[PDB]
Amino acid sequence: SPQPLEQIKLSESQLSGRVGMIEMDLASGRTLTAWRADERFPMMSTFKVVLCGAVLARVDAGDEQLERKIHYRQQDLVDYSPVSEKHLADGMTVGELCAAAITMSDNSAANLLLATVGGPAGLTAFLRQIGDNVTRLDRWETELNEALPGDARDTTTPASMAATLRKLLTSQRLSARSQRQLLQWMVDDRVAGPLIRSVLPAGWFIADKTGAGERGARGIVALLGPNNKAERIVVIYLRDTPASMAERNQQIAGIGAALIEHWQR
């Protein structure tokens, strides 16, 4: 593999699209690699991690309980509700909804949670409260995936998303139990976690949330490290490429390979 930056560049050349990437030490916030780190990319389903950070903040304040059962109706459901469509009769707890959103990318679960935090405007307000002045959510699932060229709606930057994830996971804004819960949801991702593990060398930790949207949009927010440790946050977004999903996946994996082969920097 090339050095990480050279691999990132190669991925742009091959995809004809923009890549944005940060590699950051989880414990300290040291930025190791940055590419288009201040440029905007659609969050797609990666927003669901920040969403459940906002839910957890409400739990910590005594304004929410992960146990609380939410009952909902079939007419509430949007496209791709693998977990939530199973629970029309019995409902789902707030914690189950976050598990479904983060680990299954259940869109209706995400919208049910978004309602509880004041919708897209409420989530954006929460982001501002934790000092992210850049990331914004404007729409609900599934319109937030539109990825229109030049549209600032529903975007983050690699730098802001990495800093925000670090704040949620480590900064004691959330309680110890809540930090542990958010981490565990990412560890438990079923959409990409097992696939990623199948290609990672033995000894490498992964926790993640992935996303995909229109116009080639694709992304991952992850924790990665050797010695079975979540050493670094890695955030990679792709936009405005006509490439197949398989090719987008393989380019992201190629960037991962470059990081793994050149880890000590």
Ligand X SMILES: *C(=O)[C@@H]1/C=N\C(C(=O)O)=C(\COC(C)=O)CS(=O)(=O)[C@H]1C(=O)OC(C)(C)C
Residues assigned a catalytic role: 45, 143
Please report how close the Cβ of residue 75 comes to ligand MA4 at its closest, in angstroms: 37
**CA 208/CA 127 separation, integer angstroms:** 20
Task: Determine which residue in the list 66, 83, 207, 220 makes contact with ligand MA4, applying CB under 6 A.
Answer: 220
> Binding pattern to ligand MA4, positions 65-94, x when CB under 6 A?
------------------------------
Name the nearest CA neighbour of 186 among 204, 205, 158, 167: 205
Q: If binding means CB under 6 A, how many residues of this protein chain bind ligand MA4?
A: 18
Q: What region, left, alpha or beta, does residue 227 occupy, with left being phi > 0 and alpha being psi -120 to 50 degrees?
A: left
Q: Which of residues 72-91 bind ligand X (CB under 6 A)?
A: 79-80
Q: How far is CA 244 from the centre of its chain?
A: 21
Q: How far is CA 235 from the centre of its chain?
A: 8
Say whether residue 191 binds ligand X (CB under 6 A): yes
Binds 261, which of ligand MA4, ligand X, none (CB < 5 to 8 A, cut-off by type)?
A: ligand MA4
Stretch near ligand X under the rule CB under 6 A, chosen from 20-28, 57-65, 118-126, 208-216: 208-216
Q: How many CB atoms lie within 10 A of CB 36?
A: 19
Question: What are residue 151's phi and psi, to 5 degrees?
Answer: -85, 125
Q: If binding means CB under 6 A, how many residues of this protein chain bind ligand X?
A: 13
Binds 142, which of ligand X, ligand MA4, none (CB < 5 to 8 A, cut-off by type)?
A: ligand X
Binds 201, which of ligand X, ligand MA4, none (CB < 5 to 8 A, cut-off by type)?
A: ligand MA4
Task: Determine which residue in the list 212, 223, 235, 236 makes contact with ligand X, applying CB under 6 A.
Answer: 212
Q: How many CB atoms lie within 10 A of CB 89?
A: 6
- Smaller CB separation from ligand X, 66 or 212: 212
Task: Determine which residue in the list 84, 116, 142, 155 makes contact with ligand X, applying CB under 6 A.
Answer: 142
Give the DSSP H/E element, type plus range, for residue 220: strand 218-225
Please report how close the Cβ of residue 42 comes to ligand MA4 at its closest, in angstroms: 17
- Numbered residues of the known binding site for a beta-lactam: 48, 105, 141
Say whether residue 253 binds ligand MA4 (CB under 6 A): yes
Q: How many CB atoms lie within 10 A of CB 209?
A: 28
Sign of CA dihedral 80, 43, 222, 9: positive
Say whether residue 246 binds ligand X (CB under 6 A): no
Q: How far is CA 234 from the centre of its chain?
A: 10
Alpha helical stretches, state H, 16-63: 47-60
Say whether residue 43 binds ligand MA4 (CB under 6 A): no
Say whether residue 241 binds ligand X (CB under 6 A): no
Exposed, middle or buried, 55 (CB in 10 Å: 0-12/13-18/19+)? buried
Pairing of strands 218-225, 232-239: antiparallel
- Numbered residues of the known binding site: 48, 105, 141
Residues found near ligand X in the complex (CB under 6 A)? 44-45, 79-80, 105, 107, 142, 145, 191, 210-213
